Design a protein around this ligand. Sequence first.
Ligand SMILES: [Zn+2]
Ligand SMILES: [Zn+2]
Lengths: 97, 115, 766
Amino acid sequence: PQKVQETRKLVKTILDQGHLSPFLDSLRPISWDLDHTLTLCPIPSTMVLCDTTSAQFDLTYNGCKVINPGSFIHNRRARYMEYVPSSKKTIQEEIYI
Amino acid sequence: LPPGERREITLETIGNLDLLGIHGISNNNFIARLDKDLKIRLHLLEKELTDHKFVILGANLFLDDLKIMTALSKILQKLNDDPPTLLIWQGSFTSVPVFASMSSRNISSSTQFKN
Amino acid sequence: TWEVLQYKDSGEPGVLEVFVTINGKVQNITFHIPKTIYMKFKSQTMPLLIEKSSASLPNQLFKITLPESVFLEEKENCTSIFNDENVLGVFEGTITPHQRAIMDLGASVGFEMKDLSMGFSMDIGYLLHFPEFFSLFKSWGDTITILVINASSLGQIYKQMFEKKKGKIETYSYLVDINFEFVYFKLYRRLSQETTKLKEERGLQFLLLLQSPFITKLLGTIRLLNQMPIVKLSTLLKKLVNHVLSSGSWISHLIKLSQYSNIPICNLRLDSMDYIIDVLYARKLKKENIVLWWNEKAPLPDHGGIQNDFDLNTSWIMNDSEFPKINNSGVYDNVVLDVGVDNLTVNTILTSAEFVHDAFSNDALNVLRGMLKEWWDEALKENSTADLLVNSLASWVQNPNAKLFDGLLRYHVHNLTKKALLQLVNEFSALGSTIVYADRNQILIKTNKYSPENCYAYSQYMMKAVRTNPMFSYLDLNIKRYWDLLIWMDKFNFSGLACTAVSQWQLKKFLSPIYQPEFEDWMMIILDSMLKTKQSYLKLNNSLNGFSHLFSKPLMKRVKKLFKNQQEFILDPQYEADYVIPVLPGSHLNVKNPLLELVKSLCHVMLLSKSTILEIRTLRKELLKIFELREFAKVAEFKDPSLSLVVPDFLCEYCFFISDIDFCKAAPESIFSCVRCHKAFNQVLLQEHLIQKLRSDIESYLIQDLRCSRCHKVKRDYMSAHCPCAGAWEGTLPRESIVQKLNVFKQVAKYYGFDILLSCIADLTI
Ligand SMILES: [Zn+2]
Ligand SMILES: [Zn+2]
């Protein structure tokens, strides 16, 4: 499905690129001293890669579990997400409103 | 795109540094090391704590919309029955960006954010 | 139905509840409106209402039209045309339905909007609230409810103010008419309950006037029954009585605004004329087939998704504002014309007149020009509303809260204003004069003439000769002062005789308290000597030659005596407070000898005299000999004791006056109140502008280009270690300059006690 493919593409881009801001500094400026924080070089164990313009997901790639609770209020539901560190499950949750 | 590298492979081939201070702080004469036995002990404790849960709220949680606040009141009322270990709030806590006001009649942008 | 009083959105999408007027009654009614959308593609697709279209974009296009329900249910859910598939972005998708209604229907218009197309005399209610002090009034009741001496003082204050405002009350009596009783205070339930009592006694046929500047507006609409038609508005009971009796004038003014602009009475805001300009510009833009960059949700223009991304041009456009203000310091024995200027921005927009990628759209500019000409002609025909509008344009072109705000438009207007000021200086100088100083509000002009009484004719000729050039047809050129003799180094540091003598010196403020009177004394003596010399030379017929000789020897004798006294008393606790140097905003530097600081100041003021450099210089030598300092010693050199911190283009909304304000070189009264009018600036607004300036400069540091340190080429690549000419890369904003800027910010924050700015400064480091 389109929604799956355009998020596999996202996390594969981010983690293969190894760095949270692949874009040129003339398109997303970085504080030069602090660019080391955006680098992911030992790939994190989990990533809450939050994004309001993509579907929710809880993918895994290279052992990195990347989750996105994309937006709090969407399609007349409140949306929130329960990551469980001692098992790495990711139970999505919603309240209708 | 150049192939990503699994966490273990990266850590073992850079020399297993503590790049966080999870085990110890570094100095210019002393790079902190991510001690294997302590790593294992922590990992076993991590698997032991079945009950810990991190709750992540969605983005664009505008505090200045009553519908957001109503929804959120319901959610937090659920969470008070069984508290998270940790609770990530995030992302743009106001509907408009909060910038230098152009007028003094309305309550100013900064003051509104504080409210 | 064929007249409107209010639009508001229904809960459900695309539907409006509307309050309409016909046959002498208000009626509640409801419309259905489709959402118009524009989309752009590089390649064709048409799966399906959708119409291929043509319209100028903001700096393959299809119009799209749906009821908002089907658009909403499709867009957020399906694999539809609204999702991916070579869209370059939706353009007008942010416009709220009732904000489409106000544009296309207005006041002079369920029911399909498909077939809708392009004398007040009723009751009023009132609910103004002053935070706990909820105030309620009607045009159909003889008592007033004012919540938590009271009644007695109310009665006589009403009587006095009613007597003060009789004619204004009488002429607007037919809109709102008079004495009444009083009452005063879980309590908050009375607000909902007695508003039900209002609704029970007037189901329709009355109009509710909401609130005043100490707002809590949204929570107010939670207390208030949300189904009324509502005119939203944003021992001190004198204020409340005054507002109540002012109501009739507000209704008259709002009727004038509505009948002029075709905006319903509830929807237009008195609090911002910029909004009326937004809707009225949106009409003429869509009528000239421009895709509209209205943005409801955020200040930035809705160019589609592109508006969310950082851009070096965009960030330059937002960060930049400084006029290249001219300041030719000197002494002037010729009469100097202190020319005020106003309506400069309006003049540029009227008199103004892809390859350029930060020029505002020339189509939209042409619309703004012709529309401004229309408003201006109606102001010349004494339309109070059109006059107020043209005055308020200077706010709207800058205000980010304008619905049609665009940084490109702000910048286009701004740099045209800059060019126009330079051309105005060119015009005055082309007529044989010479400019002392110039900025966007003021010009000081050397005349090549010597007598004010001789020149009250020629000055008016000169100013007329400027305004009669078409480039300056609309300028408020105004000869605000005549300077007979002028000493000038900047607008915060001057003295002169006006046609009589005034002196003001930020220089003076840095001298220790014993010497500030001494400075003013010798400045009066300098003016007196210069004037004696001018009038002497003119009786005998650059005229200042020899003015030092009338006072040099007294000044040296005085300075010698003061130097002896300083050696006696600078260390003395009896006197040291008069020798302590003041800490101040922009306090530039440490100083070891305060008398030497006075001498440096006097000598610098006198060294402004280009005609007479030699005699002053020799006197300066003979003065510094008292300290045994050599004539050119680095200590004896005068560096300005003040560091400027200019917040560019501050707006006084009370008189729509745009001014750069310098928190260090300006006196405190000019910081906390306007110079032209004298309304006070709000403290938090002021601090917010300082934090905006601070963060703008930090960002300008981090987004800078690097320049080669020995050949000044720009660094074009991303990963070179040095320029190909072997020069090391360096900043175009060196780090030292930004350290200095943060230092003056911390000084200003400490001195004026700007708690928000000071905590921002704290949060940088910590
Ligand atoms: Zn003012
Ligand atoms: Zn070079």
